[PDB]
Design a protein around this ligand. Sequence first.
Ligand SMILES: O=C(C[C@@H](Cc1ccc2ccccc2c1)n1cc([C@@H]2COCCN2C(=O)c2ccc(F)c(F)c2)nn1)NO
Ligand SMILES: O=C(C[C@@H](Cc1ccc2ccccc2c1)n1cc([C@@H]2COCCN2C(=O)c2ccc(F)c(F)c2)nn1)NO
Ligand SMILES: [Zn+2]
Ligand SMILES: [Zn+2]
Lengths: 957, 958
Amino acid sequence: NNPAIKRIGNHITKSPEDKREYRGLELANGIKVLLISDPTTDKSSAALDVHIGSLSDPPNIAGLSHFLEHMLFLGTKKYPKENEYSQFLSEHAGSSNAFTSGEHTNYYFDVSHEHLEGALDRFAQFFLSPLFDESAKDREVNAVDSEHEKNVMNDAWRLFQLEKATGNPKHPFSKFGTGNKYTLETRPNQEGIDVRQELLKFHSAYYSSNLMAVVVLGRESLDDLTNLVVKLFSEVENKNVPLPEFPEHPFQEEHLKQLYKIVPIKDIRNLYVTFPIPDLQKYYKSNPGHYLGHLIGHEGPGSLLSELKSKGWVNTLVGGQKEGARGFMFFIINVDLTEEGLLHVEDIILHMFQYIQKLRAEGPQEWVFQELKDLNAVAFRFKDKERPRGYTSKIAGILHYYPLEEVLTAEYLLEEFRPDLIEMVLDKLRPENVRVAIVSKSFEGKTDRTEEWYGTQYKQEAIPDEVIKKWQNADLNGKFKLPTKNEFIPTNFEILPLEKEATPYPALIKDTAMSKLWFKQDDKFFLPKANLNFEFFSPFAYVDPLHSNMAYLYLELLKDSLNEYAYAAELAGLSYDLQNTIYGMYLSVKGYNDKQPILLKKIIEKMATFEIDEKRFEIIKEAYMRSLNNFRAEQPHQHAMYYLRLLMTEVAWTKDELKEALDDVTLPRLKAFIPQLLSRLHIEALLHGNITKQAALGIMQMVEDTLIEHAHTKPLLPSQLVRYREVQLPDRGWFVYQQRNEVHNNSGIEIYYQTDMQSTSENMFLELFAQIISEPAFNTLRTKEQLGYIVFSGPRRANGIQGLRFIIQSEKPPHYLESRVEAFLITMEKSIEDMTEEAFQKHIQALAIRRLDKPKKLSAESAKYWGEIISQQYNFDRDNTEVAYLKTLTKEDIIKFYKEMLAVDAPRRHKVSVHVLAREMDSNLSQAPALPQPEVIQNMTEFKRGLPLFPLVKPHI
Amino acid sequence: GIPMNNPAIKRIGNHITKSPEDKREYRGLELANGIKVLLISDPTTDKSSAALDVHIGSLSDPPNIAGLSHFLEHMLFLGTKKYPKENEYSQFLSEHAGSSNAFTSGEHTNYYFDVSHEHLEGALDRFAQFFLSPLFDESAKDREVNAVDSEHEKNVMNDAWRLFQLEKATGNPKHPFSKFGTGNKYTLETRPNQEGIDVRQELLKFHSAYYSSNLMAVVVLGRESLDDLTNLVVKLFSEVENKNVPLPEFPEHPFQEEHLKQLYKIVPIKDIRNLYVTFPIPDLQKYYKSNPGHYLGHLIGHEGPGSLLSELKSKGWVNTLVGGQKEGARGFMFFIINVDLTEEGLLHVEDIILHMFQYIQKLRAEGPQEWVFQELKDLNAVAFRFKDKERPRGYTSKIAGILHYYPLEEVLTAEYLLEEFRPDLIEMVLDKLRPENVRVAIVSKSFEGKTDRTEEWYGTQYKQEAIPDEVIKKWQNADLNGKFKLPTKNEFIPTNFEILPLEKEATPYPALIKDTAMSKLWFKQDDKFFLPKANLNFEFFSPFAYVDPLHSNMAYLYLELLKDSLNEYAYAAELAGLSYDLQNTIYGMYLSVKGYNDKQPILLKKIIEKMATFEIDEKRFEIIKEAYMRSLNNFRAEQPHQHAMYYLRLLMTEVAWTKDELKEALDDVTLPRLKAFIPQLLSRLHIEALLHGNITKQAALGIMQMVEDTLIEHAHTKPLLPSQLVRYREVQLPDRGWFVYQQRNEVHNNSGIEIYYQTDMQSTSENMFLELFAQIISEPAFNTLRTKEQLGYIVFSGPRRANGIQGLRFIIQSEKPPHYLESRVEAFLITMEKSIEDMTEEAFQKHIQALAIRRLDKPKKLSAESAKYWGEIISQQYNFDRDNTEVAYLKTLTKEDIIKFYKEMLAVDAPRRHKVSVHVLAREMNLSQAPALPQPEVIQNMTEFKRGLPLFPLVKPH
Ligand SMILES: O=C(C[C@@H](Cc1ccc2ccccc2c1)n1cc([C@@H]2COCCN2C(=O)c2ccc(F)c(F)c2)nn1)NO
Ligand SMILES: O=C(C[C@@H](Cc1ccc2ccccc2c1)n1cc([C@@H]2COCCN2C(=O)c2ccc(F)c(F)c2)nn1)NO
Ligand SMILES: [Zn+2]
Ligand SMILES: [Zn+2]
């Protein structure tokens, strides 16, 4: 019909509950396309996936493909304004991102549904005519270097790269993929390579239309969308690039039966078991690797984890197939270690091979596979509706692996047991194909090797043949037994009819001294799911560091207890979250509205009648100790945000305070704590989903009755239900707090301009200003001045107060970062006042679109309401009224607000700054303003005592 | 050569015997007109003082005009012939750092003041005219009768006043003892109008009949020499006329035979259970050198091992006992044994009384004990040798009364020193304590409904019965009871009075000699008083003493139970001049130990050990918890203005549990729960202590460590983190805001009001603005709101301080409704604006000097110096030089400064006016111009009120 379209796909199989419309098609230049018509979406979205990545970097230029990824954002022949893409999105309620994996570079964006074409055009140019400006190239090499830096001291990256460096050095799998200033600038300048030539050369060589897939979602009809995609993308040139293949596995036989001992930054104890296996991607219909992962990584009774845990050796286990690349994959079993586990790695692994041996003895189990098939099938039928941005990027990635008519289902459905493949894979899980790595600080000083890129300290030795042989003779262990039929599988998918007095927003359907119960029957999504949210308030949860530690340990121990029972439910789409908070306990139950009452009652009963297992208590406590210490190894901007949260809140226990109180938690004391915690409570709950008002009251009643019967719960007094306030800073004050990060050699800074108490006017002043400065902020402080990879501006909301905040992680000292943010603000004063009235209104509309974007799945709407409820404001219609006020704000309103609240000279300026100094650190351009002397906070307690405390917000109703 | 006799002086006494530690100089003498005079010269005193006690009181009321003595007492303040401005006397004192008071007992009317030492004579001259030329202005008399009515109304629903007059009403109705002494509007106006009495003549008649110089004792204390004090007193008081009035006597007891062997059943206002046993006895006053009454009071009322109380408490029948002689009047006394009653006790009154008579029998069996007398003598002797130095106002008032009862040379010692062992007198008094002489009274709500009589002045509901002769006979036949042993030698009697020498490194103010996670020790070796005494103060912080109502209740009961079990052990120390206080706070616990330093470390160790290792007796636990339940409930019967202040503290503090919340929580306090709470509270602590007195730095550090070591060994205490040491903040009120909180008092038929004008955090600046303003208005506010408008008896102005914040407050209890009182206070503030503007610069500087004198009045005794520091310490301001600093700054203020302050913070149209009012309604609820007031925001809920406002900072330490 049309010459630009090679073929047009037929029905793209979808879920019957999926109301979006789909058309597949393949362009003449080979670009695989999927088109999603959703006339309701408030944001439209496109994504493109190029099937090339880090594995295809030049050997002399580590990280080229990643770098190119960054550079495409900085201008094209048709749109050469460096920040034109990001600025257009920001002015039209959009955003975008991209990532570079081993075989993919993936770019995506969303934007106000009324601006798809303008965004998509600019987006298309990335793949037609990028500038690769020399100036922009020399700047953005720093963002890559800063990105690598944040990862250098991160234990997950260090290991990630160290695996690669213990395989065959000649294999692309060993490449350093992120790149840094050395590999992208310094070594190429020393070696005479022109970097810009190489970006152009790579782009022209590999960004070919035959290796691309594109997904576009908008309100427009599938037809209009077909015309729009052909317009912009058939232009792409096809250079018929062959899809790279890695048939040879990176681990050959000299890399097997090897043992690696590794010393990470954090105090952690891990055991990693790896088996090389053939590439299983083709078998995807059956999925042998997933069947095996399901059993090995089972956490229920008779499981491998179960026994390793009751032997006191392991707490968590992960098992299944791990991606490698077209040509090779891995099977892994990864456990963390107790102190005992670390002494018993030989036996832990023996136990591993014992469970594999039982899976060999029983042979494949068709009922197991069939159970997975029918659950996945139900999962797919009732899948929540995705957000555009992630949906397009996801699908754009898999289009390369499946035909058009099955791209939506290929990754949820399964087709036949195919026990031959299961046996084939299982045959690779043998002692002679094993690689073993142990991570413990106990190897400190006992290593002899250094990994080039990250510096990781490790040792390599061969597994003694005697030990391989013992593992080969693994007997059957009577403690291991296959799973039982999942008893939590849901069976009643009936959607209850809307009650005649249903409400659009949650209604307060119960209000005793015990309970406040908020209820809404789902009237948007009509899936057989419910969300049950409970806030258990008790003053004894946070009264002091000792009690705060005991709340944590109680819930951790409780969940550890429930794990075996609740794993099945989690597999059958029924999950729960149990969390301690500064006001008490948070419990969430989400999933199929069928079996929920079984799980909920089991949890409340186990809470109220818990019996602590002393060995579990010792093991989890020790873990918690290490947890607290390991915060030292977090990142500087993390540390910064933490200190700021400590400074600005009435009450807050530090890690050191908690860590000192921990030694005083004893099993008796914990046992006494729990009934005391439970003795008096107030329960605030949101119940939202496929449930009637009667059902909601009965769930609430069951919770109350179980607590009253088993723990004798009495209500709290109204006067005891107090929330913490935020420190009220003085007009024209500027406080600075200084700490050192002893692990990372970058610094961090958070800067907080506290404005005033939340209210419709103050909320929208702040939100509008943040919107107007959002893109400029990123462009000026990252893109132009390249302060660091992490640069963030936005609102801060805490305890009913709010303000503006800047967060930055950099190698520059924080006081420099201060002047640069101050300089930026001034230049923003000029920019807002030079800003046209038409631009101003573009920003108003962008914010409105964001605020009024409607929630696409039950959980999202639920969390919107929970935010209103826990925050004690209860303004469920907030978006309408606040957007309405928004639309009436003038550019002068915003200028008055800035000069009153934010400007260096503002009369009501309220500035506090946290500075985190790097490890080795010390205690033209637009001109920075002159800054007052900061009052230096030496003691958080003294700081807080000398200031007032804000009020608390008044509820709405 | 014989002397040149001054004729105004009938005689000059010999050496007035005094404590060898007492540096004041004394002279006694009797005027020609028979006034007995003691002169006290004290060249260091910052305030001087005088008092006059007339030996006439309300037993001599005219029979048809109840309360005339008392009323006359009020009227003498309101103007004399030489000083006829109604409030000259009050005004003069106020402007010269002075105050005065007076009171009317059955046989005495006692008047006293205390002002700046430079203005003795001026004060004394205005004072003297009271006894020469009262005006008894007819308008004044019509107004002041309201004050007396409001005083009586204050007392009407008070169980102690009800009982006091009920006793008078159950004796011989024709005896003066049965008179009603307060008076009220009926007996002092209404009835005298119906009966055609001219009250102003009756006043003049009484004053002239009885204010005779021969019934008068005066005491004057001043910086002036003894000779100059003599000339002065002769000058001002010689002209008081001697009508040679005979001193009234009452030789017939008010309780005759038909008033004995009686039982009375009385209904209280509060929920209380008391037993009152009374025996009539002869007038023992004349035997003061042996004190047979107090010997028997000492034994019968003893609280140590083997005691009467001891057994009654083990039976679980009583919790407290009081026994000894009770004053009556010249010619009769009583001997009492009073106990409170448990629930069981109320059912075993007959056995309680039998046990009382068994102990009395043990005393008859053993007979008088010279060694006991010996103990009494020795303790009293030591007490007098090392008597603290008194505030002059109280001292002149006390001595002026007792000049009537003792030779001049003995006024100081008569009440302390024992000289004569009189076993005959002991046996005499003991023979009067017999069932055929006994009167028994029971006070319990359980008689509610079952009474048939009504006491006429208070309304008391009671029934009267004759004690069955079979009961009297069982008490007569009280055989001995082996649980009752006499006390043993008091091993807490101090013997080491040595005053350690003043260390080289010693400091004028307390020094921080220890600062650890556990403890912060303040110390000062005494450098002023040099008595063998010390004060040891400890604040224990725990977040678990006030975390919620339940825990608060448990902190209370813990310390109540603890004090209960230490009582027998600690009683001997109490008698030996060594006492302790233990009481829960909103931050944890407070412990004070005061007295002769000798044996303190023993008592303190016993207290701390018993805290850390406490074993709760289930039976004491039940009894004390029940009493505590009653105590909460009984709050409903406090005065209206007390409620107003209570509610204000509730409203203006961050955290604060109401009586109702405490009471609801009490039922979940179980013995096991309390046993759990104990160690939890003691597990983490911070101790801040002031140790001040006759102790060295080493001994002090040892004391502190001993308290730490004990808590550590037995309760495994660890330190709290600094971040946990949080104090509570005050609610910060909004500019131009005005909130009202309204409540009703369901017992009293008056209303109460507190009005709080918040100003700002305490600083030198703000403190002195408020204090000077409050000084300027102090006297005028009393004179306008009470003396002129007669809003009530209780009228108060002054600073309020709480949680580092401050402001101005008025408190009034009145029959009129709160909103009326608001307008009249507001009216008053306006008049004070004009008054300050019209005040001369000298009159202003005069108010400044008055406040200065008051702020720099140097403490006279160790306890008062200690208290001054302790306030600096628990307020965490640590500003030990505050008086010198703040007075310095005071002296530079100008009347413009104060008018600016008033217009900014206080005036009705002030931009930073922060007004909260508490209105307490009564059970049943021209003049200057009141401004019109904004509509007030009515607080309907304290939690929401507090949630919606900011909280102030805390004051910066020094
Ligand atoms: O490193 C990566 C991720 C890398 C990709 C990248 C690289 C270079 C860019 C240059 C200019 C604009 C966007 C560029 C984006 N990346 C994402 C972000 C975040 C997080 O997600 C959304 C964007 N974003 C922002 O911060 C942000 C916020 C507000 C703005 F107005 C704005 F323009 C950007 N930062 N860097 N892949 O390999
Ligand atoms: O009732 C009684 C006691 C009665 C004696 C009395 C009687 C009538 C008076 C008339 C005018 C002035 C003082 C009169 C005093 N009394 C004492 C007080 C309190 C507490 O002691 C100090 C005075 N005082 C004040 O409140 C007060 C406060 C500030 C002032 F500037 C001021 F002049 C007075 N109130 N009534 N005896 O039988
Ligand atoms: Zn990147
Ligand atoms: Zn009076």
